[PDB]
Structure formats: structure tokens, C-alpha cells
């Protein structure tokens, strides 16, 4: 049997003496592994981006959870946050001033853009990868998410779920003001509410092979679009994808909300009580919960 690889990537940094992060990672990784099922020839590759202290914390957590109940093959890989930061920076520098907390351009923010240049960072042998937050709880076999790659329409490079709060309604205020009739920042099903980065299907091949996507990474394109949209953010990759998602929705396969059911309600209590429901509504059988903004996940 020719072995078939599946690749996941999670950020796991500054985890030493950070108990809330470790407990989050524990909830994510146990549900993931408890519920995952893979055929005998298949291998689940778990990529962690970590400085050396967090690598050790991750190893201690992983040993307690591996091998997985289901008995499938699993490989753990660590990538140095510092090595990735230096590889990312040339590509990512120019977008940092628009999407980082706050300004200007710091190395410490570069890693929050890893997904945007993932196709240039991972070895070419990896054709696809799913990048996942650690404040998640899995309610299904992660293997099922991979089939959504098959639903990418021509030109689509990334699979991503919508943002479930009106944060982008707020961020795009001036563009909305100047364009009363825009769908930019509006709720679904017909509005463009932007994206959440907690669950992302990164088709590295399609990213590498897309002329449009490559252009959008260029400093002058980043700058032209940020100017056009009067866009400032501090959520990194999420903000960049949201923005180029306004201009070029063909790039994105929108995942159903049940693949990244966000629980954060912070924006409800900060000016958006009326419209909040229209953003936050998600129905159907939930596959992944996302306890964003430190929101306890139900049990």
C-alpha cells in the first residue's frame, strides 16, 4: 500500500506557565484524537509551530494522548517559530502594518501571517494542510474535513468559514459609509461578513499555482486594496484573507458554519446588539466548536 498522508498544523507558542492555553490544547487534541479514524495505510501528521519551551510542553501533552484509541498511524512534527518567522518576513512584511496590533512592522507579529505564505513555507511534497486553532473542540472525525478539498471550484485556493460576529461590519465602516449599497461587512446569506481563521483548508498546490493569489501577496497590491477598503486590523491572516475575499471571492471555498462554530459574543456588547444575531446564527449538526475570545465551550 502506498501510504497516504494527512497534514494538520497548529500554532502552539508561549505555552510554558500558561495554563489556560495548555488546557485549551488539551481539550482540542483529546477530542481530535479520540474521534479521528483513518484507514490502515493512512498517516495523520500533526505539525506544531512552537519555540523550544512550548515544544516540550506539547510533547508531554502528546505522550499522554498517543497512540490514539483508533490505533491509526500518527506522526508529530515541530517547526521552529523563529525559523518560520524569518522565512515569512520578506513575503509578509508589507501587509503587517495593516493587519497587526497595531503599528508598525515587528518580527513578533509575522507568525500571525503564516497561513498566507504557507505554500512557500511547507516542503513541496505537502500538497494540502489544515491549519487549526487550539481553542477548538472536535465533534466528528477530522478525516471528514479533508473531503471539502474536493468541493473547491476552479480558482479557489483556500477553504474557510465566515466570521460569526459583526467585527468586519465595524472594521469596514468607512468603506460601508462611502458605499451605502455594499455587501462588504453585511451578514449572510447575501452579505460578505468576512472570515474566521480558526479552521483553514490550505491547498498549497492551488496557492502556488494561482497567478491571482501570487499577485495579491505583492506589496503594491496589498497596499492598493487596504487603501481602497480603508482597512486596518490586528487579526493577521484572518484580516488579509477577509480583505482579498471582498475583492476576490472566487479564491475561497466557504465552509459551512458547523465546521467552525465560533462562540465569542464580545462584539454583541460593543455596539451591535441589533444585528448580532444575523451574524452569529448557525444551525445544523456541529462538527467543530471554536471557543474564541476565551469563551468556555459547552459540554
Amino acid at each position: 500500500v502506498v501510504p497516504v498522508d494527512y497534514h494538520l498544523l497548529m500554532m502552539f507558542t508561549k505555552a510554558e506557565h500558561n495554563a489556560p492555553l495548555q488546557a485549551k490544547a488539551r481539550v482540542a487534541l483529546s477530542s481530535l484524537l479520540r474521534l479521528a479514524k483513518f484507514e490502515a495505510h493512512e498517516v495523520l501528521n500533526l505539525h506544531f509551530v512552537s519555540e523550544e519551551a512550548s515544544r516540550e510542553v506539547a510533547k508531554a501533552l502528546l505522550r499522554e494522548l498517543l497512540p490514539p484509541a483508533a490505533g491509526f498511524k500518527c506522526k508529530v512534527i515541530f517547526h521552529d517559530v523563529a525559523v518560520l518567522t524569518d522565512k515569512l518576513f520578506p513575503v509578509v512584511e508589507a501587509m503587517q502594518k495593516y493587519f497587526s496590533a497595531g503599528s508598525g512592522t515587528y518580527y513578533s507579529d509575522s507568525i500571525f501571517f503564516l497561513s498566507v505564505a504557507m505554500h512557500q513555507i511547507m516542503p513541496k511534497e505537502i500538497p494540502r494542510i489544515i491549519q487549526l486553532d487550539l481553542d477548538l473542540k472536535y465533534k466528528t472525525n477530522i478525516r471528514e474535513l479533508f473531503e471539502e478539498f474536493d468541493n473547491f471550484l476552479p480558482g479557489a485556493v483556500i477553504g474557510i468559514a465566515r466570521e460569526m460576529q459583526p467585527v468586519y461590519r465595524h472594521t469596514f465602516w468607512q468603506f460601508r459609509h462611502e458605499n451605502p449599497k455594499t455587501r462588504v461587512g453585511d451578514p449572510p446569506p447575501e452579505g460578505l461578513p468576512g472570515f474566521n481563521s480558526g479552521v483553514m483548508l490550505l491547498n498549497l498546490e492551488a496557492m502556488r499555482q494561482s497567478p491571482l493569489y501570487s499577485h495579491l501577496l505583492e506589496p503594491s497590491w496589498v497596499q492598493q486594496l487596504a487603501d481602497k477598503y480603508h482597512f486596518r486590523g490586528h487579526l493577521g491572516d484572518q484580516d488579509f484573507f477577509t480583505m482579498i475575499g471582498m475583492e476576490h471571492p472566487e479564491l475561497f471555498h466557504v465552509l459551512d458554519c458547523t465546521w467552525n462554530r465560533q462562540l465569542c459574543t464580545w462584539w454583541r456588547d460593543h455596539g451591535y446588539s441589533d444585528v448580532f444575531q444575523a451574524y452569529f446564527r448557525c444551525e445544523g449538526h456541529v462538527k467543530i466548536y471554536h471557543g474564541n475570545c476565551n469563551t468556555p465551550i459547552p459540554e
Binding site: 465595524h170 486596518r232 490586528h234 460593543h270
Partner: protein
Amino acid sequence: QCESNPCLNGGSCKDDINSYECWCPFGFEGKNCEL
């Protein structure tokens, strides 16, 4: 990370050094859109 700017104008982080005005979403008032 930074706390989101509750204001509609200026940078994405609250207490943007380069901002002097704060325009609050409807129904809120104050230097940080409190009440």
C-alpha cells in the same frame, strides 16, 4: 494582542496614539464607548 478599538475611526487597537477623536457605534458614549 491588543484590545479592539471600540471607536469607528482610527487604528484597530484602542488608544491608537495617532487618534484624537472617537466615533462610537450607535447607542454608546464616552472616550471608549462605555455607556
